[PDB]
Structure formats: structure tokens, C-alpha cells
Amino acid sequence: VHHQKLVFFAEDVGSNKGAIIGLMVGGVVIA
Amino acid sequence: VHHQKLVFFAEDVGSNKGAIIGLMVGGVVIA
Amino acid sequence: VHHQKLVFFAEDVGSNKGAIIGLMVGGVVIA
Amino acid sequence: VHHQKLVFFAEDVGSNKGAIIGLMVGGVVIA
Amino acid sequence: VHHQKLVFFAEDVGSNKGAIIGLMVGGVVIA
Amino acid sequence: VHHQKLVFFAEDVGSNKGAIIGLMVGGVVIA
């Protein structure tokens, strides 16, 4: 298979106080 | 298969205090 | 198969205090 | 006059992604 | 006058991704 | 006048990714 640009932003992000995950597959994120 | 640009923003994001996930497949996100 | 731009915003997002998921397939998101 | 415990929680708060205000008297909150 | 414990939590707060304000009297909060 | 303990937590705060303000009277907070 092929994955690409799963998340994409074309313009500026101010902040990320949380989670940004291209491809969450297991385990535990807490943001 | 082929995946691409699953999430896309063309303009600026101010903030993300939560979760942004291209392709959640298992495990646990808490944002 | 082919997926693309599953979620798309063409203009600016102010905030995301919740979940934005291109393709949720299993597991647990809590935003 | 006397004010006290205007807002009160006795048990655990999970999250506050919004506004919690004891006493709003003017100005502008955006949560 | 007298103010006290305007906001009160007795048990644990998990997170505050927003605003918690004892006494908003003017100006601008954006959380 | 007299102010006291305007915001109060009795138990542990996990995180503050936003604003916690005893007494907002003017100006601009962005959290």
C-alpha cells in the first residue's frame, strides 16, 4: 500500500496544544 | 490501496487543543 | 481503492478543541 | 455585600475546553 | 465588599485548555 | 474592598494549556 500527506496544512499553524497524528495504529496519546 | 491528503487545511489553523488524526486505526487518543 | 481530501477546509479554522479524523477505522478518540 | 464559592465542584473535573467564571462583570471571554 | 473562593474545585482538575477566571471585570480573554 | 482565594484548587491540577486568571481587569490574554 501507499500513504502520503495523511495530515496536511498548506497555511501556518498558530499552535498545537493537542495531538496531531499522521497514522495512529496503537498505544496511547494524551495531549 | 492509496491514501492521500486525508485531512487537509488550505488556510491557517489558529490552534489545535484537540486531536487531528489522518488515519486512526487502533489505540487511544485523548485530546 | 483511492481516498483523497477526505476532510477538507478551504478557509481558516479558528480552533479545534475536538476531534478531526480523516478516516477513523478502529480504536478510541476522546476529544 | 458578600460572595462565596460562587462556582463550586465537589468532585473531579475532567477538562475545561471552555469558560468557567466566578463572576463576570464586564469585558469579553471567548472560550 | 468581600469576595472569596469565587471559583473553587475540591477534587483534581485533569486539564484546562480554556479560561478559568475568578472575577472578569474588563478586557479580553481568548482561551 | 477585600478579595481572597479568587480561584482556588484543593486537589492536583494535571495541566493548564489555557488561561487561569484571578482577576482580569483589562488587557488581552490569549491562551
Numbering used by the authors:
A (entry chain D), B (entry chain B), C (entry chain F), D (entry chain E), E (entry chain A), F (entry chain C): 12 to 42
Per the authors:
pmcAmyotrophic lateral sclerosis/parkinsonism-dementia complex (ALS/PDC or lytico-bodig) is a fatal disease found in the Chamorro population of Guam (1–4), some families on the Kii peninsula of Japan, and the Auyu and Jakai people of New Guinea. Abundant filamentous amyloid inclusions that are made of all six brain tau isoforms are characteristic of ALS/PDC. We now show that tau filaments from Guam and Kii ALS/PDC adopt the CTE fold in brain and spinal cord. The greater heterogeneity of amyloid filaments, when compared to CTE and SSPE, probably reflects the fact that ALS/PDC is a multiple proteinopathy based on neuropathology, as suggested for cases from the Kii peninsula.
